[PDB]
Amino acid sequence: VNEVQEVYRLQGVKINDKHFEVVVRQMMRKVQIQDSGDTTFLENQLVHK
Amino acid sequence: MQDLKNTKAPVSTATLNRNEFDSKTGNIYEAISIASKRAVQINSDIKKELLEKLEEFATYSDSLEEVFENKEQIEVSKFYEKLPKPHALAVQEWLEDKIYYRNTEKDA
Amino acid sequence: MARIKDNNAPKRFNKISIGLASPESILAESRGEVLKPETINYRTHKPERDGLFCERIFGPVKDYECACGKYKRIRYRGIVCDRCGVEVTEKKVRRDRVG
Amino acid sequence: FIIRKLIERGIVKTVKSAKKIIDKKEPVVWDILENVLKGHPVLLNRAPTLHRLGIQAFQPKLIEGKAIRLHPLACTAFNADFDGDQMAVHLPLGPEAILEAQLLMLASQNILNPANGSPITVPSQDMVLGLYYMTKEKRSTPEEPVIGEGLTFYSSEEVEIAFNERKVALNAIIKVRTKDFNEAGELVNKIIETTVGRVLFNTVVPEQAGYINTVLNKKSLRNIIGDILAVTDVPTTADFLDKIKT
Amino acid sequence: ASLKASPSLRGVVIDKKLFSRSIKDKRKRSEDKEAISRLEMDYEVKFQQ
Amino acid sequence: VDTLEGLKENVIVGHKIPAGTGMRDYDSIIVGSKEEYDEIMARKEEFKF
Amino acid sequence: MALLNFQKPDKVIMIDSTDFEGKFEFRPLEPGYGLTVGNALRRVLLSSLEGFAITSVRIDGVEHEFSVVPGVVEDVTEIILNLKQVRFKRQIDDVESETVSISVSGKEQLTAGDFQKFISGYQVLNPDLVICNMGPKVSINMEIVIEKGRGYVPAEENKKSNAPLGSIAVDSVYTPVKNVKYSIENYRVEQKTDYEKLVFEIITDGSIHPKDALTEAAKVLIHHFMLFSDERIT
Amino acid sequence: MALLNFQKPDKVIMIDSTDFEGKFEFRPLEPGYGLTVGNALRRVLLSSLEGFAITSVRIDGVEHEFSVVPGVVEDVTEIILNLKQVRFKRQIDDVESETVSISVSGKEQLTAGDFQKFISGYQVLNPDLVICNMGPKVSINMEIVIEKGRGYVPAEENKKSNAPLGSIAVDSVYTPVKNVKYSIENYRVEQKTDYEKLVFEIITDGSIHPKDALTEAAKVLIHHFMLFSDERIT
Amino acid sequence: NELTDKAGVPRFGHTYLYDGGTGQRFDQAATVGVIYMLKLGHMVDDKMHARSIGPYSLITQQPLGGKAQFGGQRFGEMEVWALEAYGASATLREILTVKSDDVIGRAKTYESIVKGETMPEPGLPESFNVLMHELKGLGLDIRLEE
Amino acid sequence: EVVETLGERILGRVSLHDVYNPLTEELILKAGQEISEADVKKVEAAPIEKVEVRSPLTCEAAQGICAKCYGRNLATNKMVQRGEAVGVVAAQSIGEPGT
Ligand SMILES: [Mg+2]
Ligand SMILES: [Zn+2]
């Protein structure tokens, strides 16, 4: 959030942090599997949390 | 049918305060839904009333190409033209707490 | 006059399912088999028999008129023909019939 | 809609005759259309539509010519200048669509930028220059005297009377008794040293925002509009915007 | 199959042109042969001048 | 199997988007005049008594 | 004959009117005439019209403007500002300059109407205007001067040699007209959405009615324009 | 009675005036009234005065405006643009329109003054205007329609549904007043050095003498301002 | 400067002007002169275009595009994004179905506006059926289920 | 140097915990209550430097976000209401100044 906001702040653009927070939340909805276990999930699988 | 000769709804568009409009429901989208449904009902009622008024001045002229100037029909149509539109009447009804609404799913 | 009020309201749906299509389903939904690589005859500029534009498979081109022009107008809905086998219906069925 | 009114009036009984009458451009068409327009806003759109303010509902009026007349204060929302730009007009049909246009899309409702919350319908260019010129102070010097400097007025009424009679200059420094906040936040009458132009600007500022005693630039105007919207509601802010534009 | 003005065209007709292929008839063919002979004679007259 | 939950699917299919005025719980709202409802229920109560 | 194709207005419509404010309507006007009529009427009405005001106030126990009057909450400046709002109407004809000596005691609030018993040649239109707030056992004595003037005259231009010693010069709003405004909207006649519609607003202190102000301004303009007649040019 | 102290001006004084240019004086004037009187008169003079102009033209051998007359140097668009500048004045009372047939041959130039022979109810004020350039053996048989109006009427509003073949509706400019200038000078009456003098300079095209243009403008203003009387307010 | 002094014109063209509607001189002097002005070929006559109903496409059953074709304006992706952001389900629905390609719906809506009745219930757009037929022509079994 | 004030960054959000003034001990910020301008003024006049607010990054709604999780609708300067397509607004707000 801070790094993306810095680019806009360097040129006098005011955007609330809520928008970047929503996008970043949409950027972190998945997890990477590393142990298959007894579930139907498989290895190296990006699955929704 | 409400008194259409003494309505306080604006004839044209106005800047309505949203806080007053959505105070009763807590959601302006819900208020718009309710007002639009009431506007449909009001439009149906107004159409029925206008058809009843126009059936009186039903001058039985079989000719179709010629344009007929019936003054009474024009006067009635003019009266109903300058009235606030059905959505405006529904908005005025909603702001005056004269709309009854309920949710069938929530009440079941 | 006004358009004919088709009372066949669209069937409401909530889902779309996708999958591999079997040959049996393709044959079952089809109205015929395209047998010729022709589209329109070069001498008459009319859809060819058993071609890609065939009126036997994909529907009539004219509204409420068959190919041979023997059955005409709304009185003859659903009668295909004795001669050209082209159903007398709305030409809009050329957007829904497959081969 | 014109066809519906034509059939209702008894002028015609079929759609084709109504279309022919409309295409003939008769006075009855304009008489019908004046009332048909009312309560039926149109969505104006300028491409590219970067944010939701690129589509805005406006209540239309019949004008001469072939060009759409657009409010200047909406230009900043549309990124629209008048060097050859074109706009598209879409007509909502259903009552719910018209209600959405009137209560969610109306330009008088789109005062704040959804990106940051600060006002977007702020005066610009000629409007800001005129407000700045009216609210800037001028000090009297022996070479160029300023009429009516140092005069005390009982209200904005007397300032208006003196200005209308050409007895005090627009940029003269005067003292006026008006309502302003105290240290506790209550509105009390006090004598403020201000300018005539500031008094005239404050005759349209809502009394709940106090008294504004600053030279009006774009930043100050944006802050003032935000404050007025904070204390008052949207309609009052819209009327204030229109008045200060004028 | 007529050409109709769109509801934006307002103007004045300033010129009209019709270009046609001469109909090939038998009598027209004999007339064309006589005319081409006369034109050939006139053009040899011009040649000689 | 797509259940048509987002905005894009309902835009493509032509259904009301699940946002703004198109939320699914606004399709079950019955509206009417308050005076008419009051009169109807008063008549019902009078008939019941 | 001269005005045959002209789209003349019908007459003046008095939409709303009180003794203080009044709004009038002129329609339909040909293009460019709303501005002419509105500007002419506003200029005539915003000229230095005749009226009466207070020109000098002399309060006993006070010698300069920035002084404290015993028992009165407001200073001399606030008293002068309040006195500037007293509106007068002529009652006895041919009355120009009047000096009024006023002594008020036993009241919690000195108002304009309390001067009425001491004022002879004029009548106070707003007797409920709070001139000052005084204490319980406070007696106020003041001499005011009511004169006749034109428009707004500041203190410097309003000093008179006949004023009593110790008086303070006061700005005077002689004019009866408080404010004049006009707007020109578009009026539709047949297929023309470009006709004009003049809306006039007059706010007056109450001495003259807004309709009377409009009629008098129109009369002045008519008298001025009648001199451009054929018989009145040499 | 409050308006009686106004300084009423004497009359309008004609200093110099030919049939085209005129200079007038309005004196004495109250401070600020020269501006309103002058601006109102200027607006009315420039906007709403009647004059005569050509509304339609038909040239033999010419089907539409975008054509050419054989032997004439100018096209028909240029001929129409020159005919727009032909100014007319009344010569006989009670004439509202006139169709003039003109036949000119044998002259190297067709000018406006050539139309006076065929015109009975009007006078051409600018006979030296060159309508077109022609050869010595080129004959023009044309027909113009001179009408009456105010302001500028485009060709679309001069199109007659009963006009003969070849008739071209021509943009009409009717305004007789070309320039209005006014100045405000200081005028001294007795001991007062603050009165005003309004100096007017009017340039017209010759159809109306400047004095009568001033009288007509005053009449229009007076007719508009009479509607503000008490009897015409509801 | 020399030429303006020779022509009786104030230097830099700085002249005091008078308002035509009021007559008062402007407070400050303004730059006045003669400028060479051109008229470009972008005329409002060629740009204005209005359509209620007109020709549609025979493939997509959507309004054509262009003044010569009497077409309709394009409500693209960004306009739909703006409509969604506002929350206008109804306006977006009318734009998607009844104004573009609901073949029965648009005729019924025209009739309902002329007759004053209630608006018709929109149906499936025809472009969706074109998409479904293309998918079936690609050998995919697309099924709409309730 | 302070570029963005804490008051400009906590305005419109939702206070996660009951925040008391460390000096005078009053409940300045209430849990679940939107930070209005009055709360901003109170905090700026109090010795508070870090405020824990609810953010979309840390809302546990099954589908989307909800009103308290998000905060204030910047288009209306009121609490965000149910049904708002805050994602499209966020994307448009970020992308508009990209040019
Ligand atoms: Mg541009
Ligand atoms: Zn057949």
Side-chain angles (χ1 to χ4, degrees), chain G residues 98-114:
Chain G
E98 162 104 11
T99 326
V100 192
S101 292
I102 278 142
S103 183
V104 176
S105 63
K107 302 201 60 227
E108 325 151 338
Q109 207 132 330
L110 169 61
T111 71
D114 292 323

Side-chain angles (χ1 to χ4, degrees), chain G residues 10-138:
Chain G
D10 282 314
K11 50 181 98 165
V12 199
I13 315 322
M14 176 129 69
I15 290 286
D16 215 343
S17 197
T18 329
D19 267 37
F20 294 91
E21 322 217 319
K23 175 169 65 20
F24 310 83
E25 253 166 29
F26 216 29
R27 26 148 285 281
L29 279 152
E30 265 265 273
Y33 272 82
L35 205 34
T36 321
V37 161
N39 187 53
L41 286 172
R42 181 172 193 267
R43 285 192 63 92
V44 167
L45 273 171
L46 282 186
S47 75
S48 286
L49 303 170
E50 278 217 6
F52 314 92
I54 288 172
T55 88
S56 319
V57 53
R58 168 187 171 195
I59 308 166
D60 297 301
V62 202
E63 305 169 2
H64 58 123
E65 44 195 357
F66 319 119
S67 178
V68 279
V69 173
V72 181
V73 157
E74 304 99 2
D75 50 65
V76 188
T77 319
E78 220 57 90
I79 294 183
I80 281 193
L81 290 187
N82 290 328
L83 276 172
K84 262 140 67 145
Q85 322 182 222
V86 180
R87 302 324 289 160
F88 295 111
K89 196 173 185 178
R90 212 188 212 175
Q91 221 145 33
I92 305 174
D93 300 334
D94 302 334
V95 173
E96 291 210 336
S97 63
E98 162 104 11
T99 326
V100 192
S101 292
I102 278 142
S103 183
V104 176
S105 63
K107 302 201 60 227
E108 325 151 338
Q109 207 132 330
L110 169 61
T111 71
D114 292 323
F115 305 158
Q116 180 84 281
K117 323 162 200 101
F118 308 95
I119 292 173
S120 46
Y122 311 95
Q123 164 194 5
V124 179
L125 295 214
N126 47 306
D128 296 3
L129 177 80
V130 182
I131 288 305
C132 83
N133 271 276
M134 28 203 279
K137 30 81 256 297
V138 180

Side-chain angles (χ1 to χ4, degrees), chain C residues 41-60:
Chain C
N41 196 252
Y42 72 96
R43 213 179 154 198
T44 57
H45 297 170
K46 316 197 118 44
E48 266 258 355
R49 225 180 164 301
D50 283 37
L52 288 172
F53 277 178
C54 190
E55 287 182 296
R56 270 193 182 61
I57 308 171
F58 295 114

